[PDB]
């Protein structure tokens, strides 16, 4: 076949990753173990640990933009509420 | 020329054969690797080695007789070969230096030298051999948490942590008289039949073997030791065979011998064979086969071991072997079965009747402990011609069809797909 350019991942056998020695893997086959292990304990506990770990990264931006949105909405409401003759004109321009 | 057995305290058996003229007498203890806990592994190895060194040095210097041994899973086949006219001396030495006394043998110096020698031997076995290593790993991964997965050699951590007391404790808990026999394969007739039972020629430690709490089990697993440094590859499938003393030993042996061995670098093997060998030979896929169906008193293993050279083409070799096993359990030609019967006949004839008395003695000991009585090959030939296609169909419908497999290999296995590309394709969805 027509040779192609250099590639960072080979196929099986010549996969290209660093050669290693002494690493041992295992398995127990799907049929010899219960499919649903932990199901609830891991569910609740890991779910709460994960939600605790990254809470602030989603809390802070949401709070900031919610504060902006609330302030903008309230000022817009005040603008067109018995204020179209004394405040609307001086800020529209 | 007929095997004789009895029961007078210690079982004595004899397979007279005036064809050869190398008389052999020894013991076959019904315990070994299977009869011992994981934490103290190489105790049997250490026993065998201390014997095979110092007792050898004693016997050759004193008299003429070369002593061997063997441990497979539950034997200590301390066979002591001799001349036809020199069996009394061999028996006297065996009963004066193996059962008792053990003080002149287990000196600290000899024990320590043998300990370091055993360490070196097991180490270079780990660093050099490969098919035996993957076979041992296959046993260790098929029988997790069971007194059969531990190897017949042991682990360095388990080897180092035992000095004298553990060895003597195992001696006194397994070198009894209840599960120990005497085997006299060679060209002796009845001198061994009467001289074993004498005024004092008897094993010490009367009692019984401590029964194991759990015997055996099975579960699918993998133990791969992927290292690209080694040149070739190594894999070993496995499916749970049939234990000894069952009406399935010979049918399983035939179901294994159908596909047969293969050596890709021999002019007299590529040309012959059956479908998988041709379909492999069209390209270059594999380099060796070994269909083996090993059986033990607790459970047996039907295996398939290869050591290929191509690395990218593992998947195709596995896929073809699996489809051929499915073909075995779906439909077999009558000529295939007849050829298998003939081949297995000649193979048994060679194995059981090899001129070397030690092999026959070890096999006789194994059978007499497990079966309770020797099965002369005449009955085997009589009952082997009755094996028919329906029987093999039925047996493969149980042992093979959608049954958990265990594989374990060291080398460049990386190309091998993990589990669901070698397991869920034993039926090919069209039976
Ligand atoms: C909808 C929006 C929310 C879901 C977003 C998408 C979730 C998704 O893609 O599926 C994930 C899927 C579980 O994830 P997974 O892929 O198993 O776990 C991988 C995790 O990354 C690793 O997580 P883990 O292993 O730590 O634990 C995960 C755990 C955590 O999951 C939870 O418990 C939920 C936590 C998040 C939600 C919290 C409240 C909000 O998940 C479960 O509890 C698995 C539920 C398994 C149900 C068992 C069903 C058995 C067969 C039933 C047969 C019925 C037959 C019917 C008739 C025919 O979520 C669910 O199935 C939970 C919802 C259903 C609950 C029903 C009770
Ligand atoms: C809208 C219309 C419907 C959209 C359909 C789009 C397709 C479905 C996509 C589902 C999806 O993103 O699954 C991710 C999948 C997240 O689990 P995964 O599959 O391990 O995903 C990796 C994430 O980076 C997991 O991140 P992590 O490991 O850092 O843990 C944080 C995780 C933990 O989330 C929590 O805070 C637990 C309660 C969340 C509700 O937060 C989530 O990923 C929540 C995403 C769903 C809410 O959804 C779940 O939250 C399933 C339960 C685990
Ligand atoms: C997405 C791809 C998912 C399927 C790939 C897959 O399972 O690969 C594993 C397996 C790997 O192939 P292999 O290991 O070389 O085959 C050895 C067996 O002899 C493979 O078994 P085989 O030789 O019987 O395969 C030929 C034929 C494949 O069925 C057909 O599609 C021919 C009709 O097998 C059947 O499954 C036929 C019986 C089921 C008929 C169901 C009709 C539903 C409509 O491939 C299949 O099982 C192919 C199934 C194709 C079914 C339709 C796929 C549609 C894809 C879109
Ligand atoms: C409709 C409203 C429903 C509200 C509740 C939603 C589900 C919340 C589940 C939380 C269960 C309590 C905390 C875990 C306790 C626990 O783990 O108890 C033990 C079991 C599972 O433990 P395990 O064997 O998987 O641990 C595996 C390793 N030992 O749990 C249950 O079988 C809960 C059954 C009730 C549901
Ligand atoms: C009418 C039209 C339909 C006809 C259907 C015919 C069914 C049999 C098809 C060939 C099978 C066969 O040939 O199986 C008989 C031989 C017997 O090999 P063996 O058992 O001696 O191997 C010894 C161990 N058992 O298998 C083979 O050679 C296999 C060759 C490779 C497989 C190729 C299959 C491709 C066609 C599949 C068609 C499936 C539908
Ligand atoms: C990328 C495409 C992503 C979308 C593709 C979704 C449809 C393809 C799924 C094929 C799975 C398969 O063909 O599975 C084949 C497996 C085989 O078992 P096995 O593979 O271990 O045998 C491998 C070696 N013998 O049997 C099953 O699963 C049976 C369950 C099939 C469920 C089909 C559900 C159809 C949903 C259609 C959704 C709309 C499309």
mmCIF file with all atom_site columns, C-alpha atoms and ligand atoms in Angstrom, chain B residues 420-421 424-425 429, ligand 6:
data_model
loop_
_atom_site.group_PDB
_atom_site.id
_atom_site.type_symbol
_atom_site.label_atom_id
_atom_site.label_alt_id
_atom_site.label_comp_id
_atom_site.label_asym_id
_atom_site.label_entity_id
_atom_site.label_seq_id
_atom_site.pdbx_PDB_ins_code
_atom_site.Cartn_x
_atom_site.Cartn_y
_atom_site.Cartn_z
_atom_site.occupancy
_atom_site.B_iso_or_equiv
_atom_site.pdbx_formal_charge
_atom_site.auth_seq_id
_atom_site.auth_comp_id
_atom_site.auth_asym_id
_atom_site.auth_atom_id
_atom_site.pdbx_PDB_model_num
ATOM   1  C CA  . UNK B 1 420 ? -15.770 -10.176 25.203 1.00 0.00 ? 420 UNK B CA  1
ATOM   2  C CA  . UNK B 1 421 ? -13.924 -10.740 21.933 1.00 0.00 ? 421 UNK B CA  1
ATOM   3  C CA  . UNK B 1 424 ? -19.004 -14.232 23.606 1.00 0.00 ? 424 UNK B CA  1
ATOM   4  C CA  . UNK B 1 425 ? -17.958 -15.744 20.271 1.00 0.00 ? 425 UNK B CA  1
ATOM   5  C CA  . UNK B 1 429 ? -24.898 -16.806 16.755 1.00 0.00 ? 429 UNK B CA  1
HETATM 6  C C1  . LIG C 2 .   ? -21.875 3.849   16.280 1.00 0.00 ? 6   LIG C C1  1
HETATM 7  C C2  . LIG C 2 .   ? -23.367 3.542   16.172 1.00 0.00 ? 6   LIG C C2  1
HETATM 8  C C3  . LIG C 2 .   ? -24.028 3.803   17.526 1.00 0.00 ? 6   LIG C C3  1
HETATM 9  C C4  . LIG C 2 .   ? -25.521 3.492   17.436 1.00 0.00 ? 6   LIG C C4  1
HETATM 10 C C5  . LIG C 2 .   ? -25.715 2.026   17.049 1.00 0.00 ? 6   LIG C C5  1
HETATM 11 C C6  . LIG C 2 .   ? -26.934 1.462   17.782 1.00 0.00 ? 6   LIG C C6  1
HETATM 12 C C7  . LIG C 2 .   ? -27.411 0.188   17.085 1.00 0.00 ? 6   LIG C C7  1
HETATM 13 C C8  . LIG C 2 .   ? -26.252 -0.798  16.963 1.00 0.00 ? 6   LIG C C8  1
HETATM 14 C C9  . LIG C 2 .   ? -26.188 -1.676  18.213 1.00 0.00 ? 6   LIG C C9  1
HETATM 15 C C10 . LIG C 2 .   ? -25.643 -3.048  17.817 1.00 0.00 ? 6   LIG C C10 1
HETATM 16 C C11 . LIG C 2 .   ? -25.316 -3.842  19.079 1.00 0.00 ? 6   LIG C C11 1
HETATM 17 C C12 . LIG C 2 .   ? -24.947 -5.255  18.711 1.00 0.00 ? 6   LIG C C12 1
HETATM 18 O O1  . LIG C 2 .   ? -24.920 -5.596  17.553 1.00 0.00 ? 6   LIG C O1  1
HETATM 19 O O2  . LIG C 2 .   ? -24.652 -6.132  19.679 1.00 0.00 ? 6   LIG C O2  1
HETATM 20 C C13 . LIG C 2 .   ? -24.431 -7.530  19.373 1.00 0.00 ? 6   LIG C C13 1
HETATM 21 C C14 . LIG C 2 .   ? -24.347 -8.289  20.695 1.00 0.00 ? 6   LIG C C14 1
HETATM 22 C C15 . LIG C 2 .   ? -23.432 -9.500  20.526 1.00 0.00 ? 6   LIG C C15 1
HETATM 23 O O3  . LIG C 2 .   ? -22.874 -9.844  21.791 1.00 0.00 ? 6   LIG C O3  1
HETATM 24 P P1  . LIG C 2 .   ? -21.285 -9.811  21.574 1.00 0.00 ? 6   LIG C P1  1
HETATM 25 O O4  . LIG C 2 .   ? -20.928 -8.546  20.903 1.00 0.00 ? 6   LIG C O4  1
HETATM 26 O O5  . LIG C 2 .   ? -20.528 -9.906  22.988 1.00 0.00 ? 6   LIG C O5  1
HETATM 27 O O6  . LIG C 2 .   ? -20.847 -11.043 20.644 1.00 0.00 ? 6   LIG C O6  1
HETATM 28 C C16 . LIG C 2 .   ? -19.622 -10.661 20.020 1.00 0.00 ? 6   LIG C C16 1
HETATM 29 C C17 . LIG C 2 .   ? -18.842 -11.926 19.661 1.00 0.00 ? 6   LIG C C17 1
HETATM 30 N N1  . LIG C 2 .   ? -19.783 -13.043 19.497 1.00 0.00 ? 6   LIG C N1  1
HETATM 31 O O7  . LIG C 2 .   ? -25.675 -8.726  21.081 1.00 0.00 ? 6   LIG C O7  1
HETATM 32 C C18 . LIG C 2 .   ? -26.545 -7.860  21.627 1.00 0.00 ? 6   LIG C C18 1
HETATM 33 O O8  . LIG C 2 .   ? -26.164 -6.788  22.024 1.00 0.00 ? 6   LIG C O8  1
HETATM 34 C C19 . LIG C 2 .   ? -28.000 -8.226  21.746 1.00 0.00 ? 6   LIG C C19 1
HETATM 35 C C20 . LIG C 2 .   ? -28.809 -6.980  22.105 1.00 0.00 ? 6   LIG C C20 1
HETATM 36 C C21 . LIG C 2 .   ? -29.091 -6.181  20.831 1.00 0.00 ? 6   LIG C C21 1
HETATM 37 C C22 . LIG C 2 .   ? -29.889 -4.925  21.179 1.00 0.00 ? 6   LIG C C22 1
HETATM 38 C C23 . LIG C 2 .   ? -30.235 -4.170  19.897 1.00 0.00 ? 6   LIG C C23 1
HETATM 39 C C24 . LIG C 2 .   ? -30.920 -2.850  20.256 1.00 0.00 ? 6   LIG C C24 1
HETATM 40 C C25 . LIG C 2 .   ? -31.193 -2.059  18.979 1.00 0.00 ? 6   LIG C C25 1
HETATM 41 C C26 . LIG C 2 .   ? -31.286 -0.569  19.311 1.00 0.00 ? 6   LIG C C26 1
HETATM 42 C C27 . LIG C 2 .   ? -31.313 0.244   18.015 1.00 0.00 ? 6   LIG C C27 1
HETATM 43 C C28 . LIG C 2 .   ? -31.075 1.719   18.339 1.00 0.00 ? 6   LIG C C28 1
HETATM 44 C C29 . LIG C 2 .   ? -31.282 2.562   17.081 1.00 0.00 ? 6   LIG C C29 1
HETATM 45 C C30 . LIG C 2 .   ? -30.187 2.250   16.062 1.00 0.00 ? 6   LIG C C30 1
#
